[PDB]
């Protein structure tokens, strides 16, 4: 990796989210997107480090403050779509081929801290919030499929969540020290998804019936000792971080226990090892991987950007390189690999963008 | 026989071996699974990457201003800033669960210890060329895990009746799980409202599967083996004959052979004894109930007067004990227990935040809803109010000297009613079959669609 | 009446074809059930046999929501009607009896009940 450009947006506000569009055709340019302040900004990546400004939106409301976004598409139109949201607890679906805000969803009773689309159904949007709940939307039929929370959901702000590779289960993390598994291939859930596609308001006087899933298929407060602010699956293992300056690699149950047989009362976790790094003990600092999940990259409170190679075995001897640059001193809030891992964008507490290239 | 210094050295040498042995086991167990995990990725990611090859997604294209610079001498870019048209947000709301009734909330390992013992054990055996000089060495090296004795037996280391292993047992041992773990009050097992265990007096008025069921059924049936047989199933009006010969919260009082006088908890606590009490039936302190014919919403009726709802097992005449069909009934004084709340609507308040609106009219003094939440000790309310003050907020409401009901985490829709010093509703805590509950009542008539308020201040004078 | 109302369980707005936000006629809201059968299972102290009956009884007492002593007799008769099949199929007849006897020691049901029910159950077991 070599650093080969650095951009600064005019607003001087922290950039909390960055996300490459992993739906680009083979041959189309690598586009990524940025959120911060009350703006959403798209960029095309070119050769020799050139980063080309494509579009940018600003919320009519001045006190919006976008924390996250995610790319999906419209099956029946092949247009990319960008979902974004933040502290006003509102989701917008932006259609960049048309420059509209085409949908929006009011509902979460507080700030949305993350957004993730379903790996295989472009229309299912999961949103994580400061109201202590997840929420799974079906954006085609405009229906709220399910609220993940309640008597055994998160006792406090939910900071992050992630679908597994196939789209069968979600894991979530948040300020209560807890990570949680929510299956969505129960008969109940798949049934609620189907039912949600069928919902036609023009043919009834009854509001669609949203699943109140009060109970996680598994819970634990035993990996970290402080709010948990990023979590992503690595296979059927789980990677998660707090502020104790280490990404932890763990699985629910005992060592040989199978993720799909883990029972909602299992009380064992198995820690497979961790990745070490320093000076990242402020909250809300997220990591990521490739589409192929061979590379793991995490940025710093002082401008440092780590990249581990998940190809090895043990975390201890995990191949780690530390990308650095004299000019990058801002805390890195999030990173993103282009689908083909060729590029690595990091964004910062100071409006700055840093593009790294492989080879 | 080898010498204490020696043995304790072995403890250390061996423990430190086993530990280090198991350290490597797992070392690989992990290495093993990180791989068998990787294939899983590969095989699945490919599936995704296939699906993505099928698709043909349109490229994003170029379009008030926004600029972007570049701390690497790249040309300033400038572009049109599009505005997303305003959308309205709703007020803040944190997750809560729906209640229709209050809910109570309260305020070197063994696996290896054994290997080391048998390790040590084999050396004491291999000596000749379960000992006691061994447990002593282990106690030396881990004096915290116990003494010799306590380890000497740690090492050495509730029937069912429908299953194959049904012992033959006492009758009070077949009914134990039931007797303790059941609420005479709500008729539920391990109920969600009543933590105190029922006193002993509150539950008194072949193969094991047969012997047990016998020693149990005789406690209830005694000597009528004609019936003891009919029930036991496969024995006889004989055979059984043959097997024979070989404001303070209320809590029920149980002081046998003691009158409910000045030493009785109920009388000290200023409460009436209730049906759940184990005192005489003659008890001068029981509450009679009313013999009203109907209504029961005036000082005329003794129950209403004493701020009680009617009791379906004492007020046999007002209509309170019949018609478990409708929530409209002769007796207007059992709205809480039967749970006959009014439809409420939730919309952003006209003052602040969320508020609550009644959907159909309502007369002066009519019941609107119960205010429900979790019951918690006065100390839990403390601890919790520390965390709450951050919010300049509170949905704590005193129930009595011992309990607070907190609607923060769970409750029902009347919790969205806002405070006012000029309310159209008020809160009255009533006794209801031995439970204090909060009933929200209208203060003056109220019309379709009005917003609901009551004065949080009295619910806060637990002085 | 002329205003904009929201469902109390999702905060989505009410399309006009309502009023009615009684998405909490939940006499026995779903989670309270799941919570209860979970809490029983948590005892290391009770057969899987006396559990499955406690679970089923509770779900039963919750669904109809009896509140008086003078309902218990009819409640047992009701329990066996509606949950009788399972009590049989799951092999829980004897435990069910220790239940019926316990409910007697607690002074809720009569003796004519504590078998008028055992009758109706076998009278049902054989129906299979
Ligand atoms: C009458 C009325 C009642 C309710 C319940 C609301 C909605 N609302 C107000 C905002 C709010 C804050 Cl600032 C903090 C907490 C909160 C947490 C979280 N932990 O403790 C408290 C305490 C909670 Cl619960 C809420 C909340 O739900 C309303 O608008 N009106
Ligand atoms: Zn109870
Ligand atoms: Zn007494
Ligand atoms: Zn008493
Ligand atoms: Zn008495
Ligand atoms: Zn009366
Ligand atoms: Zn009465
Ligand atoms: Zn009455």
Curated annotation (Swiss-Prot), chain A:
Belongs to the WD repeat ESC family. Residues 68-222, 220-359 are annotated as: Required for interaction with the matrix protein MA of HIV-1. This is Polycomb protein EED. It is linked to Cohen-Gibson syndrome: An autosomal dominant overgrowth disorder characterized by accelerated osseous maturation, advanced bone age, skeletal abnormalities including flaring of the metaphyses of the long bones, large hands with long fingers and camptodactyly, scoliosis, cervical spine anomalies, dysmorphic facial features, and variable intellectual disability. Residues 1-359 are annotated as: Interaction with EZH2. GO terms for molecular function: chromatin binding; enzyme activator activity; identical protein binding; methylated histone binding; transcription corepressor binding. The WD repeat domain mediates recognition of trimethylated histone peptides at the consensus sequence Ala-Arg-Lys-Ser. This is achieved through an aromatic cage encircling the methyllysine, and involving Phe-16, Tyr-67 and Tyr-284. The lineage of its organism: Eukaryota, Metazoa, Chordata, Craniata, Vertebrata. Changing residue 283 to A: Abolishes binding to H3K27me3. The modification N6,N6-dimethyllysine is found at residues 116, 187, 203. GO terms for cellular component: chromatin silencing complex; cytosol; ESC/E(Z) complex; nucleoplasm; nucleus; pronucleus; sex chromatin. Induction: Expression is induced by E2F1, E2F2 and E2F3. The modification N6-methyllysine is found at residues 116, 187, 203. Its main location: nucleus. Polycomb group (PcG) protein. Component of the PRC2/EED-EZH2 complex, which methylates 'Lys-9' and 'Lys-27' of histone H3, leading to transcriptional repression of the affected target gene. Also recognizes 'Lys-26' trimethylated histone H1 with the effect of inhibiting PRC2 complex methyltransferase activity on nucleosomal histone H3 'Lys-27', whereas H3 'Lys-27' recognition has the opposite effect, enabling the propagation of this repressive mark. The PRC2/EED-EZH2 complex may also serve as a recruiting platform for DNA methyltransferases, thereby linking two epigenetic repression systems. The chain holds residues 82 to 440 of 441 of the full protein. It is found in: Nucleus; Chromosome. Expressed in brain, colon, heart, kidney, liver, lung, muscle, ovary, peripheral blood leukocytes, pancreas, placenta, prostate, spleen, small intestine, testis, thymus and uterus. Appears to be overexpressed in breast and colon cancer. The modification N6,N6,N6-trimethyllysine is found at residues 116, 187, 203. The keyword Repeat applies. GO terms for biological process: cellular response to leukemia inhibitory factor; facultative heterochromatin formation; genomic imprinting; heterochromatin formation; negative regulation of DNA-templated transcription; negative regulation of transcription by RNA polymerase II; oligodendrocyte differentiation; regulation of adaxial/abaxial pattern formation. Keywords: Acetylation, Chromatin regulator, Chromosome, Disease variant, Host-virus interaction, Methylation, Nucleus, Phosphoprotein, Repeat, Repressor, Transcription, Transcription regulation, WD repeat.
From Swiss-Prot, chain C:
Residues 3-79 are annotated as: VEFS-box. Sumoylated, probably by PIAS2. Overexpressed in breast and colon cancer. It comes from the Eukaryota. The modification Phosphoserine is found at residue 23. Induction: Expression is induced by E2F1, E2F2 and E2F3. It is found in: Nucleus. It is linked to A chromosomal aberration involving SUZ12 may be a cause of endometrial stromal tumors. Translocation t(7;17)(p15;q21) with JAZF1. The translocation generates the JAZF1-SUZ12 oncogene consisting of the N-terminus part of JAZF1 and the C-terminus part of SUZ12. It is frequently found in all cases of endometrial stromal tumors, except in endometrial stromal sarcomas, where it is rarer. Polycomb group (PcG) protein. Component of the PRC2 complex, which methylates 'Lys-9' (H3K9me) and 'Lys-27' (H3K27me) of histone H3, leading to transcriptional repression of the affected target gene. The PRC2 complex may also serve as a recruiting platform for DNA methyltransferases, thereby linking two epigenetic repression systems. Genes repressed by the PRC2 complex include HOXC8, HOXA9, MYT1 and CDKN2A. Component of the PRC2 complex, which consists of the core subunits EED, EZH1 or EZH2, SUZ12, and RBBP4, and various combinations of accessory subunits including AEBP2, JARID2, PHF19, MTF2 and EPOP. Within the complex, interacts (via C2H2 zinc finger domain) with JARID2 and EPOP; JARID2 and EPOP compete for SUZ12 binding. Also interacts with AEBP2 and PHF19. Forms a monomeric PRC2.2 (class 2) complex consisting of at least SUZ12, RBBP4, AEBP2 and JARID2. Belongs to the VEFS (VRN2-EMF2-FIS2-SU(Z)12) family. Under hypoxic conditions, the precursor SUZ12 RNA undergoes regulated trans-splicing with the JAZF1 RNA, resulting in a chimeric isoform which may be protective against apoptosis. The chimeric transcript is characterized by JAZF1 exons 1-3 joined to SUZ12 exon 2-16. The chimeric transcript is expressed primarily in the endometrium from late secretory and early proliferative phases of the menstrual cycle, but not in normal myometrium at any phase of the cycle. Its expression is slightly induced by low levels of progesterone, but suppressed by both estrogen and high levels of progesterone. This is Polycomb protein SUZ12. It comes from Homo sapiens.
């Amino acid at each position: 990796f070599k650093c080969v450009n650095s951009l600064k947006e005019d607003h001087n506000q922290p950039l909390f989210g960055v996300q490459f569009n992993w739906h680009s055709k083979e041959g189309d340019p690598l586009v990524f997107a940025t959120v911060g302040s009350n703006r959403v900004t798209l960029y095309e990546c070119h050769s020799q480090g050139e980063i080309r400004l494509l579009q940018s939106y600003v919320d009519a409301d001045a006190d919006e403050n976008f924390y996250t976004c995610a790319w999906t598409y419209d099956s029946n139109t092949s247009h990319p779509l960008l979902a974004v949201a933040g502290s006003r607890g509102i989701i917008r679906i932006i259609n960049p081929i048309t420059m509209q805000c085409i949908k929006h969803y009011v509902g979460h009773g507080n700030a949305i801290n993350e957004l993730k689309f379903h790996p295989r159904d472009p229309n299912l949007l999961l949103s994580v919030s400061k109201d202590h709940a997840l929420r799974l939307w079906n954006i085609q039929t405009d229906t709220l499929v399910a609220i993940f929370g309640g008597v055994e959901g998160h006792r406090d702000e939910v900071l992050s969540a992630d679908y597994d590779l196939l789209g069968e289960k979600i894991m979530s993390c948040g300020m209560d020290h807890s990570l949680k598994l929510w299956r969505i291939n129960s008969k109940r859930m798949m049934n609620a998804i189907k039912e949600s596609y069928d919902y036609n308001p023009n043919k009834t006087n009854r509001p669609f019936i949203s699943q109140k899933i009060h109970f996680p298929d598994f819970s634990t407060r035993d990996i970290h000792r402080n709010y948990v602010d990023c979590v992503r699956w690595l296979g059927d293992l789980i990677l998660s971080k707090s502020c104790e300056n280490a990404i932890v690699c763990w699985k629910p149950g005992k060592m040989e226990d199978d993720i799909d047989k883990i029972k909602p009362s299992e009380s064992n976790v198995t820690i497979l090892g961790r990745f070490d790094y320093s000076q990242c003990d402020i909250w809300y600092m997220r990591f990521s991987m490739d589409f192929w999940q061979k590379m793991l990259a995490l940025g710093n409170q002082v401008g440092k950007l780590y990249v581990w190679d998940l190809e090895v075995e043990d975390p201890h001897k995990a191949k780690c390189t530390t990308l650095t640059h004299h000019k990058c001193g801002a805390a890195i809030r999030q990173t993103s690999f282009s689908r083909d891992s060729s590029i690595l964008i990091a964004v910062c507490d100071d409006a700055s963008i840093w593009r790294w290239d492989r080879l | 026989e080898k010498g204490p210094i020696c043995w304790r050295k072995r403890v250390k040498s061996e423990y430190m071996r086993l530990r280090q042995l198991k350290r490597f086991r797992r070392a690989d167990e992990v290495k093993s699974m990180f791989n068998s995990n990787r294939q899983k990725i590969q095989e699945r990611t490919e599936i995704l990457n296939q699906e993505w090859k099928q698709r043909r997604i349109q490229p994003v294209h170029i379009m008030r201003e926004c600029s972007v610079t570049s701390d690497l001498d790249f040309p300033k870019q400038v572009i049109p800033l599009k505005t997303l048209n305003a959308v309205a947000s709703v007020p803040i709301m944190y997750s809560w669960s729906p209640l229709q009734q209050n809910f109570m909330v309260e305020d070197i390992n063994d696996e290896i210890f054994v290997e080391l013992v048998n390790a040590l054990g084999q050396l004491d055996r291999r000596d000749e060329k379960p000992s006691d000089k061994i447990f002593e060495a282990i106690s030396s090296m881990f004096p915290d895990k116990g003494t010799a004795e306590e380890l000497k037996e740690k090492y050495k280391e509730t029937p069912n009746i429908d299953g194959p292993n049904a012992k033959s047992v006492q009758r009070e041992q077949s009914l134990h799980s039931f007797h303790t773990l059941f609420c005479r009050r709500c008729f539920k097992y391990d109920c969600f409202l009543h933590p105190f265990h029922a006193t002993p007096n509150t539950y008194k008025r072949w193969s094991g599967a047969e012997a047990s069921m016998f020693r149990v059924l005789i406690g209830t049936y005694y000597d009528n083996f004609c019936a003891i047989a009919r029930l036991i199933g496969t024995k006889t009006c004989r055979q059984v004959y043959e097997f024979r010969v070989k404001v303070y919260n209320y809590q029920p009082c149980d002081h046998p052979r003691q009158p409910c006088d000045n030493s009785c908890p109920c009388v000290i606590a200023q409460n009436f004894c209730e049906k759940f009490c184990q005192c005489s039936s003659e008890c001068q302190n029981r509450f009679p109930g009313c013999r009203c014919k109907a209504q029961c919403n005036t000082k005329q009726c003794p129950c209403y007067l004493a701020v009680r709802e009617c009791d379906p097992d004492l007020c046999l005449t007002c209509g309170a004990a019949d018609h478990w069909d409708s929530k409209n009934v002769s007796c207007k004084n059992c709205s809480i227990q039967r749970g006959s709340k009014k439809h409420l609507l939730l919309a952003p308040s006209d003052v602040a935040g969320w508020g609550i609106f009644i959907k159909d009219p309502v007369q002066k003094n009519e019941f609107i809803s119960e205010y429900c939440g979790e019951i918690i000790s006065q100390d839990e309310a403390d601890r919790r109010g520390k965390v709450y003050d951050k919010y300049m907020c509170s949905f704590l409401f005193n129930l009595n000297n011992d309990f607070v009901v907190d609607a923060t985490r769970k409750g029902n829709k009347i919790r969205f009613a806002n405070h006012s010093v000029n309310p159209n509703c008020y809160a009255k805590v009533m006794m209801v079959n031995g439970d204090h509950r909060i009933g929200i009542f209208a203060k003056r008539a109220i019309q379709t669609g009005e917003e609901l308020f009551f004065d949080y201040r009295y619910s806060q004078a637990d002085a | 009446h002329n205003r904009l109302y929201f469902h109390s369980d999702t905060c989505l707005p009410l399309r006009p074809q309502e009023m009615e936000v009684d998405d909490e006629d939940e006499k026995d809201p779903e989670w309270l059930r799941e919570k209860t059968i979970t809490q029983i299972e948590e005892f290391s102290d009770v057969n899987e046999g006396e559990k499955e009956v406690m679970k089923l009884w509770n779900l039963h007492v919750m669904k109809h929501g009896f509140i008086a002593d003078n309902q218990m007799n009819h409640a047992c008769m009701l329990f066996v009607e509606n949950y009788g099949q399972k009590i049989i199929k799951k092999n829980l007849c004897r435990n069910f009896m220790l239940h019926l006897v316990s409910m007697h020691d607690f002074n809720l049901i009569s003796i004519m009940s504590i078998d008028k029910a055992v009758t109706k159950l076998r009278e049902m077991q054989q129906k299979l």
